[PDB]
Amino acid sequence: TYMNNTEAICDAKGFAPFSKDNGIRIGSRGHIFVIREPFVSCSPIECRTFFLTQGSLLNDKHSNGTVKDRSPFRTLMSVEVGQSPNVYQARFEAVAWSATACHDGKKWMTVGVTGPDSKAVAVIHYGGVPTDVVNSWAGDILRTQESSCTCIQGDCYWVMTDGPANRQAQYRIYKANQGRIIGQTDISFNGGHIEECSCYPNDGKVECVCRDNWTGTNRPVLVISPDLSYRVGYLCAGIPSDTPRGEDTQFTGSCTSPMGNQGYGVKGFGFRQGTDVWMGRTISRTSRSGFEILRIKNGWTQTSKEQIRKQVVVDNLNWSGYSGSFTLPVELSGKDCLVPCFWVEMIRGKPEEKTIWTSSSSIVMCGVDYEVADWSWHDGAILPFDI
Amino acid sequence: TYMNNTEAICDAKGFAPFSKDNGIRIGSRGHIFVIREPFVSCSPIECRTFFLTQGSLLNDKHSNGTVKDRSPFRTLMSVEVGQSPNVYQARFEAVAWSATACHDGKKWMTVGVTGPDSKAVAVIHYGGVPTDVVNSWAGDILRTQESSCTCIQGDCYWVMTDGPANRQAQYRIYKANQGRIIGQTDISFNGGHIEECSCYPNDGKVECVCRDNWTGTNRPVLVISPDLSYRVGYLCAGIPSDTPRGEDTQFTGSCTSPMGNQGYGVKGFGFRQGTDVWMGRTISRTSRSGFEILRIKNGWTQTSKEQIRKQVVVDNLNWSGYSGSFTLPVELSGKDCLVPCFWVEMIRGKPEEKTIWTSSSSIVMCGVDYEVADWSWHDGAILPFDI
Amino acid sequence: TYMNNTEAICDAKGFAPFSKDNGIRIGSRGHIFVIREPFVSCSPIECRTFFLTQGSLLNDKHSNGTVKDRSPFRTLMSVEVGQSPNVYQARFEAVAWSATACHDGKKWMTVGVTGPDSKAVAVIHYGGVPTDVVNSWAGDILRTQESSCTCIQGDCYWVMTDGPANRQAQYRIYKANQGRIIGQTDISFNGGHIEECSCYPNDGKVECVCRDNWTGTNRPVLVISPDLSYRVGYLCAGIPSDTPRGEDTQFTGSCTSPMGNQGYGVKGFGFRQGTDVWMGRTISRTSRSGFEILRIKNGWTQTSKEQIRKQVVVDNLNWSGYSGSFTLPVELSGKDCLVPCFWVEMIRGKPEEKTIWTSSSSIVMCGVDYEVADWSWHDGAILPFDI
Amino acid sequence: TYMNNTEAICDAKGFAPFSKDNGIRIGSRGHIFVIREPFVSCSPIECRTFFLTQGSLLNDKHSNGTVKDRSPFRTLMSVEVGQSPNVYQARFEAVAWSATACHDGKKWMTVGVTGPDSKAVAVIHYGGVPTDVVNSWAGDILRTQESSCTCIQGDCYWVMTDGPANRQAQYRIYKANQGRIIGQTDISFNGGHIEECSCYPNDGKVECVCRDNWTGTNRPVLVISPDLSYRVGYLCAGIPSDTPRGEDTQFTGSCTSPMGNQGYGVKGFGFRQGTDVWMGRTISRTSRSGFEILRIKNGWTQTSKEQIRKQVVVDNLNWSGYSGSFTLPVELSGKDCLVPCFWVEMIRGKPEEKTIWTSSSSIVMCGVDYEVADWSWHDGAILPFDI
């Protein structure tokens, strides 16, 4: 049975810890893949952590990783939420150096982009098999969300970019049923920049909070209808949520354009809350360290600086990294709304630390009808490793 | 289908070995989590061992564990009874430094308490997902059973404390259906102290045998009805079952108040047997070593010293530790009563032994219509380890 | 659904290799339990290898095993046929230093004997739980088959001994349904000796070929009806099948009494084939090395020396050990008879080899309508190990 | 339910990466079997990689493998596509130094050939059990496909050879239902040579593209009808696809006979595409290195040199090896034709590299309605290993 993820996202006052895998701690001894982007998506029966591996283990010469991000070895794999990315519980998903995954209520759909920078191919899998392909359309690192795509009544939705890391690139929305591409749309966005979208369902539409890597320290926002009509803009709020970013007090916010004089970026997320917004960010303005979630009053629909809530989940003494959204299915929350949840990647090793290698672990959090006390559930491994 | 655990507990003459995981022996070489509290609970299809991990493995620098009990790394995980707490068979349960788990006949319910000492949050999971929360009510180490909670006709019951390790604290009963809190009750108990309750179903009510950490060397006893009305007191018998404790001959027992001049404690358990009681205890009065189960005649309802049976399960040459109750579902015993069972934790390493680290393994036992011969099924690893 | 294992055993001309686990080879590096008795039994869906472990791994100080056979650590565990006894695929079965397992078509029944030599307890499990117990009846190492018990139309049958390794002991048949003992019988056998029976179903009765450890170099034979009436005797054939044993040419065979002046023994097996018999034995008369199966014409019902077939499965250059029978369910062979199969244990390490430790691997074989060529599928590890 | 694999093979313009296991990279640290022939076959629910192991692990003295190819230790095992051949996810299949596997829509059928060169036995398994046998018919290394056999409406088909590696040998087709041999056929082919067939279903018949090890640098082709009538010949195209082979420009092709003056060979594959053909080959004419797939116009039915497409999947800087065909079931592609896919083995170690040992990893590819960009998804481990 296909999920209906037509409900409204749950209004929430805070976020409860769901899971912590401690994979780097464990991989000091265990057989743990060197990973990045430990992203989460859920079927009606369970939530899984997806991740990329270069086929190498923690504490093994292969972890060296002077090896290109976008290598022939990179694969998308998965375990159940909270499990470490260890070899012996891992399900193979796709050959991939860029991915999105999601479940329609019957099977898992995954997309992995691999191949040469100049003409990379995205292969869509459905039920553990290749079902369809998308080649590069602009021949400049075809890439995607690195988080959960979004299925609504059996049709699955995601966003890709193809174009420079910096200047103007091109962006498309893609639609699928049973792993077969049934629609696509180019996103009109001159002057604007979209990458690594963090999306979730809300009211029968798909909303995303993305990364502008060109000039924006505000994050773009998309609202994709089933048809493929969309509105695009920036997250209204008068508080910047990218990294790097300038001061809050030195920023005015905008619903239609990038505002800060920054290049670069980090994947992060945000959740509409009626007219309000919950926005994730690194506590640091410059580094991918510390992690905090703020609720801004009227932050989705206007240039608000009104902070309604703050919750620290990784303190500014500790490394953090990428973050993304997912939702709990109603068939698992048992609610009549979609519980917003997100994960946070906590990166260890190069470049910030002396090690030959680089991996991440995760902390996962869900919505909840209550104010949750500050804490830091940080990675915790003890570096450097044996090697 | 929800379990009916409305039956009477089985009358039993002794206890048969169910399982022994040998996890510390195995983890000399295998990839075995450093654990504590290897507690057992059963669905209608299987019995699982729950445990806490700090995300570290036996024989790995991370086992060091000069690391706070109540750390950001601590998670509740599970394997099938008798399996070691090894990485590759472990199911993630909750982020937690205090837990209870139980199954209602449809899904597993777990509660893990994590967060700061001053305002910790307990997250209830149901079906492998966050479904509800309880924040600290007194801002002093919100904590729970460290054994199996108790489901009766689909509503699940457990006991928490919030307050000093020593002096008067506060204690609540909590009720849930499908992971949603449906009731709660404060337990009136001045002069008395409740922690780490060991509970089981008996006659459509929940009975617990708990730990008084303030002044009692007798263990408290609760009887919780479906409503949340309860009687509370102390286990009547004229024999002390806590550790530390004084001599049997130097104690008179009481159904209503703590009796010995001891602080401190250990989790342990007891089973009503009509008017009789089976009581667990460490053979040592001072140390958590050796383990024995005694049957006292009239021990539940009066100040009896009448020992009906004794069974040694760990000899006084060997380390023991925490212990708790669970019951076998009728759907697995095939009886028309609830088979009482318990587990015993056998702690190795610091402080009793020279090692950088501390873990435990378990022995599990069930009820049975026969007198079972004395033995010691003790942990068995050979310390110190490589390190 | 309960199996009907009422059919006749299949007439067979030879035996095809089913499985080889290579667990000692693998455990040079992998995490492989030190095991003994890698015995096989089958449900209607799969065949599993059961084994005992002392909770220690190959290549780990714990493998030392100057440790008593009959220790507190010894547990019965299982994997799917052909898998190594590795930690991460192992299902826990029972606490045990002596076992039998079998499936009735609905659940697995296991029996593990543990406890003190003087009053050991056998715990019967059903569906992964304690369901019943048998204490020592003669207070001298209560013990059992170390191979597959036998279920016929939902009632399960096995044989135990209690008494000296040497002189007269006592022997019982035990009957069970859903893990509850429903019948028992003492076996009248003065002058005779029964241990380690290898049994299988044939024509709605249970037949076993056992080990006489007192004076017999012929193996005893039992035929147990559903009631518990039985005939007992020795395997008629004029060829000795125990180890140690004298020459074939120096033996006359007997259907009613032990014949050779040998103490000691080895578990082995035999299959009725109408009036014929297939008999297993070590190629060596003195050592547990080499393994061969012979078909004797009229060997079940008379003192025959007529060898109809011989098949070597381990050559006399290689260590062998225990062996036992099982049958393929009709629901898996797809035949209208019960395919006879057996396994052979191949023991490495002490005492025959310089190592601190002792383990075994297995080769498994099934019936088949054809003459199978001689070979040696022997253990294969390269000793001594790192240590 | 039995599969209908009666459909036409899908017409395809290129091949998308399905899976990459990185098992040699991983086995630098993980517990990875030393393998060969990582072949793929699919049930209606999943695709599995089959492989042979000698029971030894990467990085362990046992990997030495001065050990005969055709040893007593060699077993056929399997994992899910894309998983490494690691110990803890492996399903045991057969005792085997030569194999074929396939699923009929209800159970897995496997065949493993083991035993002495002079009289080897092939045991057919069905549902994880021995169901039937084939002994050597010519007493010269009875052997088979080393890739997916082929089930059509519940009857399963495969090809074996028995005879010299070089001169004339003998070749048979074998047919089975539920693991029982229901038909066989000798293949008339004087002057010709068949080994290691790569087969797939097309139009209710079985087509194979095989290895001539005697004199042919073209690959033989068989078309087996349900009856067991067949046409046999050589792949028509005017381009040689074996290794070793001469230049393309120095070859004329033939539909009926071997053409090049080469002995030796490599397993490879080809797919009919109406009248066209997709042909696999090593980029090297002399070495098993690099891998490319070419589409020849009219290549199946005539002596064409017309190259319609080329796709590189392993570049000529990298080791490659064996290759085979499988098809995606309609129940997983969701198409009304059979998606052609193939795998490529990438061999590391001896003899090409300085190591004591030899293993392989794989890349898997499927059909697809699009031109796929050149790349090299090559093995990637860093040799030599610790040892």
Ligand SMILES: C=CCC1=C(C(=O)O)O[C@@H]([C@H](O)[C@H](O)CO)[C@H](NC(C)=O)[C@H]1O
């Ligand atoms: C660990 C790497 C994370 C990672 C980062 C990151 O920002 O750190 O950048 C992505 C970008 O290159 C930019 O978004 C610029 O376009 C990149 N995607 C790929 C596949 O290139 C991804 O791998």
Ligand SMILES: C=CCC1=C(C(=O)O)O[C@@H]([C@H](O)[C@H](O)CO)[C@H](NC(C)=O)[C@H]1O
């Ligand atoms: C290995 C530790 C076991 C352990 C012990 C124990 O008595 O040894 O004490 C619990 C208490 O602190 C006391 O009951 C006093 O309140 C503690 N709970 C937490 C989470 O603090 C638990 O971790």
Ligand SMILES: C=CCC1=C(C(=O)O)O[C@@H]([C@H](O)[C@H](O)CO)[C@H](NC(C)=O)[C@H]1O
């Ligand atoms: C590796 C040991 C195998 C093993 C042997 C064996 O003959 O080698 O002997 C069994 C006997 O003692 C005898 O049959 C004499 O009664 C023993 N059973 C137990 C549990 O004592 C069993 O463990």
Ligand SMILES: C=CCC1=C(C(=O)O)O[C@@H]([C@H](O)[C@H](O)CO)[C@H](NC(C)=O)[C@H]1O
């Ligand atoms: C890694 C070995 C691969 C391998 C090769 C190969 O060509 O490399 O040759 C097969 C042949 O011997 C020939 O086809 C000649 O008949 C062989 N089959 C067996 C079992 O002998 C198989 O093992």
Ligand SMILES: CC(=O)N[C@@H]1[C@@H](O)[C@H](O)[C@@H](CO)O[C@@H]1O
């Ligand atoms: C960190 C590390 O091991 N670097 C090695 C380096 O020694 C070598 O010279 C070069 C090419 O092999 O780059 C590699 O990454």
Ligand SMILES: CC(=O)N[C@@H]1[C@@H](O)[C@H](O)[C@@H](CO)O[C@@H]1O
């Ligand atoms: C037992 C052990 O390794 N202790 C280390 C110690 O060397 C160090 O000085 C301190 C802080 O890192 O405490 C740590 O736990």
Ligand SMILES: CC(=O)N[C@@H]1[C@@H](O)[C@H](O)[C@@H](CO)O[C@@H]1O
């Ligand atoms: C083989 C081996 O390690 N033996 C040790 C030995 O050194 C020790 O003196 C004794 C008691 O610990 O027996 C042990 O088994």
Ligand SMILES: CC(=O)N[C@@H]1[C@@H](O)[C@H](O)[C@@H](CO)O[C@@H]1O
């Ligand atoms: C590469 C290797 O380890 N070779 C060993 C060699 O030392 C030994 O002399 C011989 C027999 O054991 O062949 C073995 O394969």
Ligand SMILES: [Ca+2]
């Ligand atoms: Ca930016």
Ligand SMILES: [Ca+2]
């Ligand atoms: Ca106390």
Ligand SMILES: [Ca+2]
């Ligand atoms: Ca004897």
Ligand SMILES: [Ca+2]
């Ligand atoms: Ca050739």
